[PDB]
Design an enzyme around this catalytic site. Structure first.
Site, mmCIF file in Angstrom:
data_model
loop_
_atom_site.group_PDB
_atom_site.id
_atom_site.type_symbol
_atom_site.label_atom_id
_atom_site.label_comp_id
_atom_site.label_asym_id
_atom_site.label_seq_id
_atom_site.Cartn_x
_atom_site.Cartn_y
_atom_site.Cartn_z
ATOM 1 N N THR A 1 3.716 45.184 -2.625
ATOM 2 C CA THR A 1 3.649 43.788 -3.091
ATOM 3 C C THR A 1 2.808 43.693 -4.371
ATOM 4 O O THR A 1 3.288 43.126 -5.342
ATOM 5 C CB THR A 1 3.137 42.895 -1.950
ATOM 6 N N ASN B 1 -2.601 45.070 7.319
ATOM 7 C CA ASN B 1 -2.673 44.439 5.996
ATOM 8 C C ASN B 1 -3.008 42.956 6.142
ATOM 9 O O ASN B 1 -2.327 42.224 6.856
ATOM 10 C CB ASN B 1 -1.357 44.655 5.204
ATOM 11 N N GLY C 1 8.633 49.602 4.741
ATOM 12 C CA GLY C 1 9.041 50.989 4.920
ATOM 13 C C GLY C 1 9.122 51.369 6.378
ATOM 14 O O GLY C 1 8.723 50.599 7.260
ATOM 15 N N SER D 1 -0.063 40.858 4.681
ATOM 16 C CA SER D 1 1.201 41.514 4.953
ATOM 17 C C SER D 1 2.401 40.631 4.699
ATOM 18 O O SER D 1 2.423 39.501 5.164
ATOM 19 C CB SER D 1 1.255 42.031 6.386
ATOM 20 N N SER D 2 3.419 41.174 3.998
ATOM 21 C CA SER D 2 4.706 40.510 3.757
ATOM 22 C C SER D 2 5.536 40.609 5.020
ATOM 23 O O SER D 2 5.881 41.711 5.451
ATOM 24 C CB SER D 2 5.468 41.159 2.597
ATOM 25 N N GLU E 1 8.268 52.554 9.854
ATOM 26 C CA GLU E 1 7.056 52.555 10.642
ATOM 27 C C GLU E 1 7.371 52.430 12.115
ATOM 28 O O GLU E 1 8.407 51.874 12.539
ATOM 29 C CB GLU E 1 6.062 51.455 10.207
ATOM 30 N N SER F 1 3.027 49.607 5.427
ATOM 31 C CA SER F 1 2.306 48.351 5.326
ATOM 32 C C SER F 1 0.857 48.647 4.825
ATOM 33 O O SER F 1 0.167 49.501 5.382
ATOM 34 C CB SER F 1 2.300 47.636 6.671
ATOM 35 N N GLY F 2 0.423 47.927 3.787
ATOM 36 C CA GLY F 2 -0.899 48.119 3.205
ATOM 37 C C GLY F 2 -0.890 49.098 2.049
ATOM 38 O O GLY F 2 -1.925 49.288 1.418
HETATM 39 N N1 LIG Z 1 -3.597 48.422 -7.383
HETATM 40 C C1 LIG Z 1 -4.300 47.631 -6.572
HETATM 41 N N2 LIG Z 1 -5.450 47.100 -7.043
HETATM 42 C C2 LIG Z 1 -6.237 46.414 -6.204
HETATM 43 N N3 LIG Z 1 -6.056 46.162 -4.904
HETATM 44 C C3 LIG Z 1 -4.884 46.661 -4.473
HETATM 45 C C4 LIG Z 1 -3.964 47.376 -5.222
HETATM 46 N N4 LIG Z 1 -2.839 47.669 -4.465
HETATM 47 C C5 LIG Z 1 -3.108 47.145 -3.292
HETATM 48 N N5 LIG Z 1 -4.330 46.532 -3.221
HETATM 49 C C6 LIG Z 1 -4.988 45.946 -2.053
HETATM 50 O O1 LIG Z 1 -4.348 46.381 -0.869
HETATM 51 C C7 LIG Z 1 -3.820 45.255 -0.139
HETATM 52 C C8 LIG Z 1 -2.508 45.646 0.482
HETATM 53 O O2 LIG Z 1 -1.532 45.890 -0.564
HETATM 54 P P1 LIG Z 1 -0.084 45.210 -0.505
HETATM 55 O O3 LIG Z 1 0.557 45.179 -1.906
HETATM 56 O O4 LIG Z 1 -0.125 43.853 0.123
HETATM 57 O O5 LIG Z 1 0.720 46.213 0.433
HETATM 58 P P2 LIG Z 1 2.238 46.288 0.914
HETATM 59 O O6 LIG Z 1 3.048 45.218 0.193
HETATM 60 O O7 LIG Z 1 2.717 47.634 0.648
HETATM 61 O O8 LIG Z 1 2.204 45.987 2.380
HETATM 62 C C9 LIG Z 1 -3.793 44.114 -1.150
HETATM 63 O O9 LIG Z 1 -3.907 42.839 -0.515
HETATM 64 C C10 LIG Z 1 -5.010 44.424 -2.016
HETATM 65 O O10 LIG Z 1 -6.197 44.079 -1.315
HETATM 66 F F1 BEF Z 2 2.318 44.566 4.509
HETATM 67 BE BE1 BEF Z 2 3.552 45.006 3.679
HETATM 68 F F2 BEF Z 2 3.770 44.010 2.513
HETATM 69 F F3 BEF Z 2 4.814 45.033 4.579
#
Ligand SMILES: Nc1ncnc2c1ncn2[C@@H]1O[C@H](COP(=O)(O)OP(=O)(O)O)[C@@H](O)[C@H]1O
Ligand code: BEF
Length: 763
Positions: free
Chosen positions: A154, A196, A441, A199-200, A443, A149-150
């Site tokens: 996404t 996050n 993933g 977070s999704s 966790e 997460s983070g």
């Molecule tokens: N390549 C990127 N460029 C800019 N900010 C990013 C990038 N990837 C992630 N972030 C930042 O990190 C945060 C968390 O990423 P996110 O895609 O929501 O994570 P995940 O889906 O893996 O939980 C986003 O809301 C954004 O603030």
């Molecule tokens: F916060 Be991740 F998108 F599960």
């Protein structure tokens, strides 16, 4: 002389070997110098000669190992190079800020039709390789974007989708809809968690479908496991779904009054969580005083580079208009959202129990927004139908009836939103698809419940898939060709998958069995898992945990699953309750028979009095996951490993040990061990023959493909170990094909001279 030796916060540090021993090495850290420590043989790695340089592809390293990979990606990250390859795998380290122009339209253009290595590492190159392999091999493709997460799964999924629609779309605004639908799914399925801000709370598979001409015809979204526990209560640093805050912060005074909304602190379904909005100095001014909670007034806004509850509401409305969602359907969504909020404000008191007199407005507002008769709602929340006899519920049973209705209504609304999005870009037929998987993933937290169990079960299956595609098939190809490469063995996790998902004997069916018993108990279920799988390798009682914090959990109050990435200790309290997706018949009947057509249609696409109402969350998810894995196994696969650099959401803060741990848990150490001995670059004898015969003297073409290659390689004077002749192809060692294509571009007179020196008869 320099090596990599362990370090508790950096993962590795530069050292020198001063003494080699039978079981350990003596490391003198760099420029300390008198200080020395002992490190295990298998924890000390050779280091690159040049510690300043970086390679775009980790296969280009002199020593490919976890310590050299960690350093390489660290140096790159410090220079805002967040993308690095591991052969066909992409490592994406979250920058936690906007790197200028690196996702621009010009950037999208520069990555179009370019092979890996032609351009710098980028999420756009992985997307283009997928489109190109799909077009040439006439086979569907999937891109699996994984990480914690983070980590950026996404965001990178969005880059993939935006790249593919903007590059291989029709040009018309219909291509924008696959992109423009994301703010809508995120408003209803994303929430602020401690790890996050965006977070999704659901997993998704987004497919982009194409015709024979390899041009977008539409798309399809498969959603998985929307988190239901989040709908009613959150931790104090967490929030409910974004939509609740976007609506309270952004809705017009007309929408506010009509839906009877106010500041988030006035709703039980929001006020246990963080009631602050994401705003800046500018957007705070746009939010009316009657929308701001006392917590917001005292502590101010929440900060994020992208999330803005006021602005996001405006962008969501724009997204809705742009995808063809009319104002009537917009308000219908908002009405159900507010209907859930008001439901939450209903309180009960011991009579049997009844509604508190102070809950009168909440009952009124909720019934009006959900299209129900107030007395029907009152009766369905405080009684219950048994074998026919209306048994009065206790206050706690009423709270549960209330929250179960909220969770069902919201989950059904989310299904509506996903399905509505799928209708906004439909397609009659398609030849192939490029699917992008964005799901949570592996966790562990201090407390792991049914939600983590499901996510970790899913990850167990996706890791198996990754292990087969990257380690099993690759080594089978080396053995089939008879290359005599050192075998890299991975722990097969089929027994872990079986433990959870096998029919009758698996944990998910043992949980279902519990839900069907006259008096279901979490403890009875847990004892049944331990009794059935007492001798299983992947299961333990919490007592046997390596972590002291789990040693007091009774045998019937939890279990340990030895997942691929590590042991997870689950508390099984609420497993029985969380495994049931169904409402009691009275509540189901009440909401299905709403006066409002939209609400009824949420339940369109019969239980007897003393019949059990039970829908298995576990087995509904097992089914969806088995469908997903049929799709993934049918396609070509590409992997994007996302890395969370730190626990603070900050830029230019590379936490070495935390990053090493993510690379280790994702199984990349086995990939490096395979690559360091393997041949990632390869080409058939006919492929090399057809591409390079024209450059050579004519007589070389008269030779059969294998012997043409044997003659060429003798003429070039290529290092015998740098390549290896297989049964049908020439296998090139890491970064050794590049060295070959380099000389092949050399002067044809010099190529002829090289041939003359080894066989003048071929002139
Ligand atoms: N390549 C990127 N460029 C800019 N900010 C990013 C990038 N990837 C992630 N972030 C930042 O990190 C945060 C968390 O990423 P996110 O895609 O929501 O994570 P995940 O889906 O893996 O939980 C986003 O809301 C954004 O603030
Ligand atoms: F916060 Be991740 F998108 F599960």
């Amino acid at each position: 002389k320099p090596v990599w030796a362990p370090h508790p916060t950096d993962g590795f540090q530069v050292g020198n070997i001063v003494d080699i021993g039978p079981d350990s090495l003596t490391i003198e850290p760099l420029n300390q110098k008198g200080k020395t420590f002992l490190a295990l043989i298998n924890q000390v790695f050779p280091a690159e000669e040049d510690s300043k340089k970086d390679v775009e592809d980790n296969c280009s390293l002199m020593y490919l190992n976890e310590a050299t990979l960690l350093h390489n990606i660290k140096v790159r990250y410090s220079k805002d190079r967040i993308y690095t390859y591991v052969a066909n795998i992409l490592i994406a380290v979250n920058p936690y800020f906007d790197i200028p122009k690196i996702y621009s339209s010009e950037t999208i253009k520069s990555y179009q039709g370019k092979s890996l290595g032609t351009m710098p590492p980028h999420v756009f190159a992985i997307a283009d390789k997928a489109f190109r392999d799909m077009k040439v091999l006439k086979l569907s493709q999937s891109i699996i974007v994984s990480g914690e997460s983070g980590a950026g799964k996404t965001e990178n999924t969005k880059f993939v989708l935006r790249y593919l629609t903007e590059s291989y779309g029709t040009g018309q605004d219909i291509d924008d809809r696959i992109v423009e639908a994301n703010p809508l799914l995120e408003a209803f399925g994303n929430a602020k968690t401690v790890r996050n801000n965006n977070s999704s709370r659901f997993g998704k598979f987004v497919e982009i479908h194409f015709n024979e001409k390899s041009s977008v015809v539409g798309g399809f979204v498969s959603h998985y496991l929307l988190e239901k526990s989040r709908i009613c209560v959150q931790g104090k640093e967490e929030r409910n779904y974004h939509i609740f805050y976007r609506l309270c912060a952004g809705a017009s005074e007309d929408i506010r009054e009509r839906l009877h909304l106010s500041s988030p602190d006035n709703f039980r379904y929001l006020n246990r969580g963080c009631t602050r909005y994401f705003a800046n100095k500018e957007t705070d001014k746009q939010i009316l005083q009657n929308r701001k909670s006392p917590e917001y007034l005292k502590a101010g806004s929440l900060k994020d580079p992208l999330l803005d509850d006021h602005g996001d509401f405006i962008r969501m409305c724009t997204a809705m208009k742009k995808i063809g969602l009319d104002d009537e359907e917009k308000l219908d969504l908002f009405r159900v959202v507010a209907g859930v909020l008001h439901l939450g404000n209903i309180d009960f008191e011991e009579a049997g129990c009844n509604l508190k007199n102070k809950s009168t407005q909440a009952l009124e507002y909720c019934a009006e927004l959900l299209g129900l008769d107030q007395d029907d709602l009152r009766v369905s929340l405080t009684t219950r139908v048994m074998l026919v006899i209306k048994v009065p519920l206790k206050v706690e049973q009423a709270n549960n009836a209330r929250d179960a209705l909220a969770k069902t209504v919201y989950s059904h609304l989310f299904d509506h939103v996903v399905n509505r999005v799928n209708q906004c870009f439909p397609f009659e037929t398609s030849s192939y698809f490029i699917g992008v998987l964005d799901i949570a993933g592996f966790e562990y937290f201090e407390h792991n419940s049914f939600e983590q169990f499901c996510i970790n079960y899913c990850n167990e299956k996706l890791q198996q898939f990754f292990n087969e595609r990257i380690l099993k098939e690759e080594q089978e190809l080396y053995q089939k060709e008879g290359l005599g490469v050192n075998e890299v063995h991975y722990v097969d996790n089929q027994d872990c998958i079986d433990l959870i998902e096998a029919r009758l004997v698996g944990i998910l069916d043992i949980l279902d069995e519990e839900n069907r018993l006259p008096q279901p108990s979490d403890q009875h279920f847990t004892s049944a898992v331990h009794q059935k799988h007492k001798d299983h390798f992947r299961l333990s009682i919490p007592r046997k945990s390596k972590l002291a914090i789990h040693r007091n959990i009774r045998d019937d109050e939890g279990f340990i699953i030895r997942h691929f990435a590590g042991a997870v200790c689950y508390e099984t309290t609420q497993f029985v309750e969380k495994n049931n997706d169904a409402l009691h018949m009275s509540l189901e009947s009440l909401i299905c028979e709403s006066r409002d057509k939209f609400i009824r249609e949420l339940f369109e696409s019969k239980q007897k009095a003393g019949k059990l109402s039970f829908i298995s969350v576990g087995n509904k998810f097992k089914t969806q996951l088995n469908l997903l894995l049929d799709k993934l196994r049918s396609t070509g696969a590409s992997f994007i490993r996302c890395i969370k650099p730190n626990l603070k959401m900050t830029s230019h803060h590379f936490e070495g040990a935390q990053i090493l741990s993510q690379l280790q848990c994702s199984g990349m150490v086995s990939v490096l061990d395979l690559m360091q001995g393997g041949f990632p670059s390869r080409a058939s004898f006919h492929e090399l023959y057809n591409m390079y015969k024209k450059y050579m003297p004519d007589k070389l073409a008269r030779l059969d493909p294998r012997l043409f290659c044997k003659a060429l390689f003798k003429a070039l004077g290529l290092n015998e170990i740098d390549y290896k002749f297989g049964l049908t192809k020439v296998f090139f060692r890491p970064g050794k094909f590049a060295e070959f294509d380099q000389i092949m571009k050399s002067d044809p007179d010099h190529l002829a001279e090289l041939v003359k020196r080894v066989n003048h008869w071929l002139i």
